Design a protein around this ligand. Structure first.
Ligand SMILES: N[C@@H](CCC(=O)N[C@@H](CS)C(=O)NCC(=O)O)C(=O)O
Ligand SMILES: N[C@@H](CCC(=O)N[C@@H](CS)C(=O)NCC(=O)O)C(=O)O
Ligand SMILES: [Zn+2]
Ligand SMILES: [Zn+2]
Lengths: 218, 218
């Protein structure tokens, strides 16, 4: 029993978890719920031994978790990526909470039918948010320490999503673009990206008005 | 000199931090931004040494953090509240994420002009959420381990806020009410709640449609 990751067959909250596992080279299986599997999830939700049922979930033996960040952190912790003193642990948790905000800012407008309207002040406020991340990353290859951690895969997925939303916003910060290309060049990430099990779309749940549907628009 | 906790003069995301610090008896001072201090925060935000500027923030000498969860976990980690193995650290991060969701479900509708309409389905789904938390707590005095941790203050505040939104929803689970009373009976929490330092209102920012304004309604 390789561990199992359960989620919708979408990028969403689980994509940084899959990227991480692929990068560290850990075996896993996914239990994927497709667009028509709503009732199948409602059926399983309370039968999986989960203390706080939710998606995504992660199960390994008799151990189980929910909460995307707790699953990411469990895998990161096993690879020594969560820090080694109180000050370092807390800095990593601060960066995580920032990256969850960066990805959620998209999600919180993407499901509204007024998305095209909400996008306007969203795009007016985004340069200041991107500037803050650009300054924080500065000339570093990765967000914390000298090698990839779960924070880089959260950050990569948020930037790739935002870039899809408005490419000129992210292209305005050379270090953010270079960071996207850096993560995509990692040998295990490039292999995962080129493989049949990669999910390139949708970014959000299928019913979203941005980053939803079965296929990219056009 | 004592650490500084900076936030709006509202309960919001900082209240579980103030509860935790009063419980463990750590000295702290608050830098409180009032209802008309918005420009004062805009003027401070980039001039406080913060790597990822936001509210709340925490500063102790040249150490600083933002992200309410990271600040809570910093304090909690100094009091050995974040667990002692990867499995136990992960379980605590899971319960944190579910409590962040529990509090955010109120914030996500409270600031919207359509709050009164959104409240209907929110109150339709709330019982199942509270039932999950009621079964998770079960007959335990606290959410994890045998003594209060940052998880309990997060959970207390989210329940008190929800209780204000719909008192009988929470009162339908006696063990959640017993937990609210148990946290309020802790001598250091009672002394805080009876002091001049305590903020009982507003629950969200003053401009919210629910839990806003300068005093509770009617
Ligand atoms: N705080 C959460 C959110 C989890 C979540 O919102 N899950 C949505 C999918 S993005 C869901 O389908 N949950 C299943 C359910 O509520 O039954 C975490 O990061 O995992
Ligand atoms: N993920 C965050 C959210 C922080 C946030 O939304 N803060 C709001 C107040 S509740 C704010 O006024 N931030 C200051 C700003 O936007 O400049 C955390 O938990 O601290
Ligand atoms: Zn490994
Ligand atoms: Zn202390």
């Amino acid at each position: 029993m390789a561990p199992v990751l359960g989620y919708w067959k979408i990028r969403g909250l689980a994509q940084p978890i899959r990227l991480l596992l692929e990068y560290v080279g850990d075996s896993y299986e996914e239990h994927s719920y497709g667009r028509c599997d709503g009732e199948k999830w409602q059926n399983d939700k309370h039968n999986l031994g989960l203390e706080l049922p939710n998606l995504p979930y992660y199960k390994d033996g008799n151990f189980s978790l929910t909460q995307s960040l707790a699953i990411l952190r469990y895998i990161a912790d096993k690879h020594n990526m969560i820090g080694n003193t109180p000050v370092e642990r807390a800095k990593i948790s601060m960066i995580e909470g920032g990256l969850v905000d960066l990805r959620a800012g998209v999600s919180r407008i993407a499901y509204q039918e007024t998305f095209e309207q909400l996008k306007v002040p969203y795009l007016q406020q985004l340069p200041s948010t991107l500037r803050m991340w650009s300054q924080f990353l500065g000339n570093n290859s990765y967000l914390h320490g000298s090698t990839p951690t779960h924070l880089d895969f959260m950050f990569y997925e948020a930037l790739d999503v935002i870039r899809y939303l408005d490419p000129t916003s992210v292209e305005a910060f050379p270090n953010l673009m270079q960071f996207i290309h850096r993560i995509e060049a990692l040998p295990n990430i490039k292999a995962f990206m080129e493989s049949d099990r990669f999910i390139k779309w949708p970014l959000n749940g299928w019913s979203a008005y941005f980053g939803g549907g079965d296929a990219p628009p056009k």
